[PDB]
UniProtKB/Swiss-Prot annotation, chains A, B:
Amphipathic helix 9, as annotated region: 238-247
Spans annotated as Amphipathic helix 8: 208-218
Chain segments carrying region Amphipathic helix 1: 10-14
Role, per record: Might be involved in ligand transport, alters membrane permeability at acidic pH (4.0 to 5.5). Incubation of the non-lipidated form with lipid vesicles increases their permeability.
The name this protein goes by in its record: Outer membrane protein TP0453
């Protein structure tokens, strides 16, 4: 057909209903990627993949304990077969329509067309690859905040990392250390953009004396547009940011 | 006499009733001093003074707009005359008891005995040198927080910078930028100790969901001993700390 390939919507392919959404454009973030991936065994192969990748769209589903990724890039058969023919623990099979399904113990990968990859990782309850792939024809309709949508628009335009968390509450708490004082935090948005060797950030948190005080201790700004608290144009080192992701 | 010299109490000499008290021991803080004083005209002479100085005790009085300093150190006549004979705008006179009073347009300095200096800076309303000097015989009885007293005890023991602000409220606000939302902040204590090229800090503020959250964004710790909020073993760069003092 290739008619589906006319208008692929990456967010519709990862799926609606997720707890966390990520946009990660590679260009302008190569430094950070390197820091995060400087400690691995596949560092050489991951860098070759990064060189082939424009942007990653991700979604985490807590219920089924899974991550679904859509990689926009360039993954010709020779390069994917090259990567696969090195790795251990990976198996591969070719479906009736010739598209390769790669399978690992917790991870599935397909390359349905040469410009994109679909990756599904997690528990035995993670989505079937063929189900994700069906959304190449009938995409989901996820609801995403305005600036998240902006960064995803016209792939190649943005170098901003975007993260959208439906419930800031049981994401901060239910992460690693788990006491329940039940912080009444709804939707959370986080945007990250590089400058020299630092990251400019913007954080929105769904909820002015302690406003100006925090505007001084944490970089420079505070805002209130009603429901939300907005920490704008803050700063963080590429160094600490990678330590956050390490978890 | 020299009988007064048997037990000089530096805090009693700067005076009771002040708005801010400072303890600044030189050793272990030479790096910081350098950063603060790297931009001056007297940098050479100040370093020679720093080399002669064990600890500074300070007090700021808002009402009379003055700072009173007691420097414990070694300031022999040859060295003070050396410093004075270089400087412009300074005059000197010898009192009936032979002790030298140095005078500048906004600043008075005496060396009542070779191991200490008394410095009074500020408006035309600042204390008379001879009045400060009387407290070498009849010291004031200032009231200071326990850890402030600890750092001042046994001169040479501590490398911790200690700051005590009677009213955190109109010190943060009434500094530089002055809007009045009237933050109900009473006494404030701040302690600063060097490690490699960073400063470990402890801040107490007179007033647990946002407690653990701030314990994560600002270094590592929060406490509540009743009236006070205690930010313990926090961290700051020698670099930014000097920019704070620049004001």
């Amino acid at each position: 057909s290739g008619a589906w390939k006319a208008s692929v919507d990456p967010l519709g392919v990862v799926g609606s209903g997720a707890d966390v959404y990520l946009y990660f454009p590679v260009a302008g973030n190569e430094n950070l990627i390197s820091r995060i991936i400087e400690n691995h065994e596949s560092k050489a192969d991951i860098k070759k993949i990064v060189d082939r990748t424009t942007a990653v769209y991700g979604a985490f589903f807590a219920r089924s304990k899974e991550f679904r990724l859509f990689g926009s890039g360039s993954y010709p058969y020779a390069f994917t077969n090259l990567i696969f023919s090195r790795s251990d623990g990976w198996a591969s099979t070719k479906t009736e329509h010739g598209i390769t399904y790669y399978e690992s113990e917790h991870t599935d990968v397909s390359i349905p067309a040469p410009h994109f990859s679909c990756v599904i990782f997690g528990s035995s309850k993670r989505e079937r690859m063929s189900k994700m792939l069906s959304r190449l024809v009938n995409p989901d309709r996820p609801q995403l905040p305005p600036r998240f949508e902006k960064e995803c628009t016209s792939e190649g335009t943005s170098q901003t990392v975007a993260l959208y968390i439906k419930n800031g509450g049981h994401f901060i708490t239910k992460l690693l250390n788990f006491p329940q004082l039940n912080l009444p935090l709804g939707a959370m948005e986080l945007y990250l953009t590089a400058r020299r060797n630092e990251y400019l950030y913007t954080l929105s948190l769904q909820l002015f004396p302690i406003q100006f005080l925090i505007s001084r201790v944490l970089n420079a700004h505070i805002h209130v547009e009603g429901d939300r608290l907005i920490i704008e144009d803050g700063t963080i080192s590429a160094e600490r940011l990678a330590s956050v992701i390490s978890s």
